Design a protein around this ligand. Structure first.
Ligand SMILES: Cn1ncc(C(=O)O)c1C(=O)Nc1ccn2cc(-c3ccccc3)nc2n1
Ligand SMILES: [Mg+2]
Ligand SMILES: [Zn+2]
Length: 314
């Protein structure tokens, strides 16, 4: 109760900033997450014995893959922390509770392959979940861990409150299926520009939370350039692994996943910032103005990719 987590001065200052990197020391990541929960939600939101148990069970069900790993999970949770701390009054006590948990859990038991590879491999999960295959699995995995002995971090919530937070977490996790982002953003774009957007409307909150979930999921493009550049090595390691597997199925993979076409990466990253990232952070800054640093940092990294193509960098 009166046991408060403290970080060293640099982490304690840097952690409030959107572009914060959680560093290479795994054993500090759980304490970084508990520190963020206590500050976002309160020191009384969760029982520390159950939280710590939940956090280590979630860790254990993240696989040792180049990108979609325990580190990604805590990085996406930190972005959400940054957004919630800069939009203090606009979110309920349940939403703060659920959105940090959702972010930690959003890629549970990820194997490093897209929903498409699962469908073409004819994976059992692709028979069980027709769309957002992995994301339905990540939620399933979350509920399993919440149903483990001494892992129910929402024990103090009522029947109705429990159902509401699990519904927040479910929509939040489904929303990280990028294929749904495009329509979600376009609809948010139209609602903001006509003035019909209303945060008292639940279906509108759902959409805004979904865009926050995309923004947190992509926050690798909103770090300082040295971190963005090095993260990209981890992303393409999975993509090219997936391409190799497509070639084993007898399918020529998209260039993005073809390691023979790695020379086309800088221009590929250019496309992704224009088609996905900039649009995403633009609409987010429109709806939630204090999230502007994410746009600025994204814009800065777009410019760094342009310099790579021009041959000013390697
Ligand atoms: C989902 N997600 N989350 C983070 C990131 C990220 O990249 O940081 C991504 C991601 O979708 N990236 C993309 C998207 C489209 N691409 C097309 C090429 C490309 C094409 C041709 C040749 C060489 C590369 N590379 C791409 N990378
Ligand atoms: Mg995912
Ligand atoms: Zn993710």
């Amino acid at each position: 109760g009166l046991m408060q987590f403290t970080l060293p001065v640099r982490l304690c200052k840097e952690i409030e900033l959107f572009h914060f990197d959680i560093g290479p020391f795994e054993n500090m990541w759980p304490g970084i997450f508990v520190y963020m929960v206590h500050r976002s939600c309160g020191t009384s939101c969760f029982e520390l014995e159950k939280l710590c148990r939940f956090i280590m069970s979630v860790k254990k069900n993240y696989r040792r893959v180049p990108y979609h790993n325990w580190k990604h999970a805590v990085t996406v949770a930190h972005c959400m922390y940054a957004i919630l701390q800069n939009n203090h009054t606009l979110f309920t006590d349940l939403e703060r509770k659920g959105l940090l948990i959702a972010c930690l859990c959003h890629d549970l038991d990820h194997r490093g392959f897209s929903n498409s590879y699962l469908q073409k491999f004819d994976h059992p999960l692709a028979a069980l979940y027709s769309t957002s295959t992995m994301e339905q699995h990540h939620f399933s995995q979350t509920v399993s861990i919440l149903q483990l002995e001494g892992h129910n971090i929402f024990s103090t919530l009522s029947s109705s409150e429990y159902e509401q937070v699990l519904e927040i977490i479910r929509k939040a996790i489904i929303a990280t299926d990028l294929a749904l982002y495009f329509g979600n953003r376009k609809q948010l774009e139209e609602m903001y520009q006509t003035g019909s957007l209303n945060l008292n409307n639940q279906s509108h909150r759902d959409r805004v939370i979904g865009l926050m979930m995309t923004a947190c999921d992509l926050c690798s493009v909103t770090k300082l350039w040295p971190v963005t550049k090095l993260t990209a090595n981890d992303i393409y390691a999975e993509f090219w692994a997936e391409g190799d597997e497509m070639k084993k199925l007898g399918i020529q993979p998209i260039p993005m996943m073809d390691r023979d076409k790695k020379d086309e990466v800088p221009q590929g990253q250019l496309g992704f910032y224009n088609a996905v990232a900039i649009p995403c952070y633009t609409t987010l800054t429109q709806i939630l103005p204090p999230t502007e640093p994410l746009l600025k940092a994204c814009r800065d990294n777009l410019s760094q990719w342009e310099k790579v193509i021009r041959g000013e960098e390697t």
